[PDB]
Amino acid sequence: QRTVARDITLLECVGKGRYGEVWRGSWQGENVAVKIFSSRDEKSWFRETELYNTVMLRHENILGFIASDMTSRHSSTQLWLITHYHEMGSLYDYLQLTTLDTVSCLRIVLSIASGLAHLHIEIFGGKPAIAHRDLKSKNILVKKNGQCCIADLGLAVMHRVGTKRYMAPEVLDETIQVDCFDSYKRVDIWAFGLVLWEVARRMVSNGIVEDYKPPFYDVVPNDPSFEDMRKVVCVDQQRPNIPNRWFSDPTLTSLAKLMKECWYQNPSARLTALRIKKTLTKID
Amino acid sequence: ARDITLLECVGKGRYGEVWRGSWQGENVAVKIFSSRDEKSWFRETELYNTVMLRHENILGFIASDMTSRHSSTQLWLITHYHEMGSLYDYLQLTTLDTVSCLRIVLSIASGLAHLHIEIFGKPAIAHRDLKSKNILVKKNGQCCIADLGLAVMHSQSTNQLDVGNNPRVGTKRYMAPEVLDETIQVDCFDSYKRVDIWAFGLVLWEVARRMVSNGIVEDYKPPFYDVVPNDPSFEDMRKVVCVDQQRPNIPNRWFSDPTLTSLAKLMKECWYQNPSARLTALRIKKTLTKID
Ligand SMILES: COc1cc(-c2cncc(-c3ccc(C4CCN(C)CC4)cc3)c2C)cc(OC)c1OC
Ligand SMILES: COc1cc(-c2cncc(-c3ccc(C4CCN(C)CC4)cc3)c2C)cc(OC)c1OC
Ligand SMILES: COc1cc(-c2cncc(-c3ccc(C4CCN(C)CC4)cc3)c2C)cc(OC)c1OC
Ligand SMILES: COc1cc(-c2cncc(-c3ccc(C4CCN(C)CC4)cc3)c2C)cc(OC)c1OC
């Protein structure tokens, strides 16, 4: 009746971690990304698969799903997640080989806000509300049209822990109301504010730019402990530095105010993804 | 090599379709789920992730896939192919001698005991939709159990029970009294094993009817064929099993044969209304190992 060409040629490894590996692959002449999970992180494959089995998310700012594959091996299970391939790589990688003008800085952050507001919002008829729970520049891909898309729904919740560098105060101090879905949206908004800070630093104004640095680069070690982060974020209540040079630029002044309204200690005071999108459409 | 050719449809219901396919020259079974049963696909995928699930009397897993473009999703389970089909099919076209009757029912008991018993690995597994259509016949004369889409997992070792998330219920005709009257204790793993033992008793009865003794054999019939309408509803089955307290009739010719006399005793100890009085899968396997 019909042939099912399932052969994906794995061409080069574009990512490796504890989690497993991502490969650039070829299916029918067409690039795909293949995430091969470690046995240690099987739960992230199951959670992303269960989510996509519940709702087939389709959004220009969400990494495009192609397939979940489980293949039986002699004495193990092989778990692959297959998605759209973005040759420009992660925002993390990208911010380290370019600076940004005002148009490209706004296009990036508005696209991430659009992807996040799409996750957060319940649609009837539709989709459940979704919180990401591991938003960071490494989990955002850059597209050729200058918009981004959000990747990695292995920790997502519908209505492993977060990267410690990006954890909100209520996660570090264990006061998060874990039976309140809104609590998880507020944790993503905190993380969003740090990504906004990472991008805004690489936007040029009056001939000046900051070097790419991760959030809290100046106050915590590489691979910060849970304790290291709690002391900075909860006990001392430190926030990322806004450089003086931003206050000469109308875009970076508005973006400083935005990222501040993502970092309130009180989660319920933080802006929503929808309110961030509205603010970004009125900037410039 | 991952490339699969779909050669013919061997089955089709509201569940979806099964196809005979070719994959590396070998026959494979490809099940394509309806979107209405997406929760069974995911649950079956969870169950086949258990590497110690593999057993001669459990349908062998090859791959599971969810594939999507735009708003369209396909859900695939790929297994080993059994060209003799299901026990339900086979029992309609053949009678059985003693040796073949015991080999079939011992092999089903052996698969079920494998599911039910924790390995310290593999959780304890209750199937919850055991029936002759979910049992495939192999060329060595043994059977394997298929369809883990309703299965419940338990570990005594970590005190965890995973009932999963599937609104699907068992085939009505094979439902235990406590399933039909909805008094089944949902947070008790032992409850789900006891539901499997009930259904197993019905499968034993379907098989034993086809074993010849003294030149006599019954026609193939499904459980409760004589007491409910065609395509019985949940309420139809609750009436006969719960209100009327019916159980399958033991043909009197069985009492002339030592094997069928022993099997009649066995299946009746699967059918107590008190779930805790029913035999365990391991006891059934040990009893069938000693019967000849
Ligand atoms: C199983 O596995 C993989 C499969 C595929 C794949 C390859 N060709 C064709 C398909 C296909 C899509 C959709 C239909 C429709 C047509 C009829 N309609 C009424 C219902 C169903 C049929 C066939 C698929 C799904 C790709 C893979 O990798 C990219 C697979 O492995 C992950
Ligand atoms: C965050 O996580 C996931 C990411 C991806 C993913 C998707 N497109 C492209 C990429 C990528 C490609 C290429 C480079 C490099 C290599 C070539 N050059 C030297 C610079 C650029 C970096 C990154 C990735 C990593 C897929 C995933 O799943 C299948 C992910 O997990 C959910
Ligand atoms: C998973 O991913 C990809 C899949 C495919 C692909 C291959 N065969 C068949 C199909 C297909 C055909 C028809 C229907 C529908 C048509 C409307 N209605 C009647 C229900 C059935 C669905 C699916 C597809 C989508 C191609 C891709 O790209 C070229 C894919 O992306 C990598
Ligand atoms: C129950 O469940 C699953 C079963 C199978 C499966 C495996 N081998 C062989 C079969 C088969 C072949 C052929 C016939 C014949 C019999 C009668 N004749 C008039 C028409 C057709 C019947 C059955 C099947 C149906 C695969 C599955 O998944 C891939 C199943 O789901 C878990």
The tokens for A136 are 């960071």
Q: Determine the residue among A2, A3, A6 to mutate to test chain B binding: the one whose Cβ has the most chain B Cβ atoms within 10 Å.
A: A6
- Are B67 and A70 a contacting pair at CB < 8 A? no
Could you give the residue numbers annotated as active site of B? 129
Q: Judge whether B5 is closer than 8 Å to chain A, CB to CB.
A: yes
Ligand 3 atom closest to Cα of B68?
A: 1
Place of tokens 């994906």: A8
CB contacts, 8 Å: A3 with chain B: 3-6
By the 8 A CB rule, do A27 and A14 touch? no
Q: If DSSP states are collapsed to H, E and C, what string results for chain B?
A: CCCEEEEEEEEECCCEEEEEEEECCEEEEEEEECHHHHHHHHHHHHHHCCHHHCCCCECCEEEEEEEEECCEEEEEEEEECCCCCEHHHHCCCCCECHHHHHHHHHHHHHHHHHHHCCECCECEEECCCCCHHHEEECCCCCEEECCCCCCEEEECCCCEEECCCCCCCCCHHHCCHHHHCCCCCCCCHHHHHHHHHHHHHHHHHHHHCCECECCECCCCCCCCCCCCCCCCCHHHHHHHHHHCCCCCCCCHHHHHCHHHHHHHHHHHCCCCCCHHHCCCHHHHHHHHHHCC
Q: Is the CB of B68 under 6 A from ligand 3?
A: yes
Place of tokens 């009397």: B57
Q: Judge whether B1 is closer than 8 Å to chain A, CB to CB.
A: yes
> Mind telling me how many Å the CA of A20 is from chain B's nearest CA?
17
Q: Which residues pair with A34 in a beta bridge?
A: A23, A82
Residue B68 C-alpha to ligand 1 middle, in angstroms?
A: 8
Q: How far is CA B270 from CA A23, A146, B114, B225, B266, in A?
A: 53, 66, 18, 19, 7
Place of tokens 């954890």: A167
Q: How far is CA B283 from CA B117, B211, B224, B252, B280, in A?
A: 12, 22, 25, 25, 5
Q: Is the CB of A141 under 6 A from ligand 2?
A: yes
Residue B86 C-alpha to ligand 4 middle, in angstroms?
A: 6
Identify the experimental approach.
X-ray
Q: At B216, give phi and psi (nearest 5°).
A: -120, 145
Residue A213 C-alpha to ligand 4 middle, in angstroms?
A: 58
Candidates A8, A16, A19, A22: which one to mutate for ligand 2, based on the most atoms within 8 Å of Cβ?
A22
Which residue of B6, B49, B73 is in closest CB contact with A77?
Answer: B49
By the 8 A CB rule, do B178 and B98 touch? no
Burial class (CB in 10 A: 0-12, 13-18, 19+), A89: middle
CB contacts, 8 Å: A58 with chain B: 70-71
Measure the CA dihedral A77/A83/A85/A90, to 10°: -90
> Mind telling me how many Å the CA of B116 is from chain A's nearest CA?
21
Nearest-Cα residue of chain B relative to residue A53: B38
Half-sphere exposure of A282 (CA within 13 A, CB side): 8
Supply the residue whose CA is at minimum distance from atom 17 of ligand 3. B72
By the 8 A CB rule, do A256 and A241 touch? no
The tokens for B17 are 């379709």
- Are B48 and A58 a contacting pair at CB < 8 A? no
Find the helix or strand (DSSP H, E) in which A193 lies: helix A181-200
- Work out the number of other CB atoms within 10 angstroms of the CB of residue A237: 10
- Are A46 and B51 a contacting pair at CB < 8 A? no
Candidates A66, A68, A81, A84: which one to mutate for ligand 3, based on the most atoms within 8 Å of Cβ?
A66
Residue A94 C-alpha to ligand 4 middle, in angstroms?
A: 51
Buried-exposed string A34-47: b where 16+ CB fall within 10 A, e elsewhere: bbbbeeebbebbbb
Which amino acid makes up residue A25?
G
Q: Judge whether B132 is closer than 8 Å to chain A, CB to CB.
A: no
What resolution in angstrom units was achieved for this structure?
Answer: 1.6
Q: Residue B59 and residue B138: Cα distance in Å, rounded?
A: 10
Q: Ligand 1 — pocket residues by CB below 6 A?
A: A 4-6, 27, 66-67, 69, 82; B 65, 67, 74, 76
User: Which of A220, A218, A200, A192 has the alpha carbon at shortest distance from A95?
Assistant: A200
Q: Residue A241 and residue A215: Cα distance in Å, rounded?
A: 9
By the 8 A CB rule, do B152 and B189 touch? yes
Choice among A134, A152, A188, A249 that is catalytic: A134
Query: Helix, strand or coil for residue A194?
Result: helix
By the 8 A CB rule, do A112 and A195 touch? yes
Find the helix or strand (DSSP H, E) in which A17 lies: strand A9-17
Q: Residue A181 and residue A179: Cα distance in Å, rounded?
A: 7
- Are B67 and A67 a contacting pair at CB < 8 A? yes
Find the helix or strand (DSSP H, E) in which A66 lies: strand A65-73
By the 8 A CB rule, do B2 and A6 touch? yes
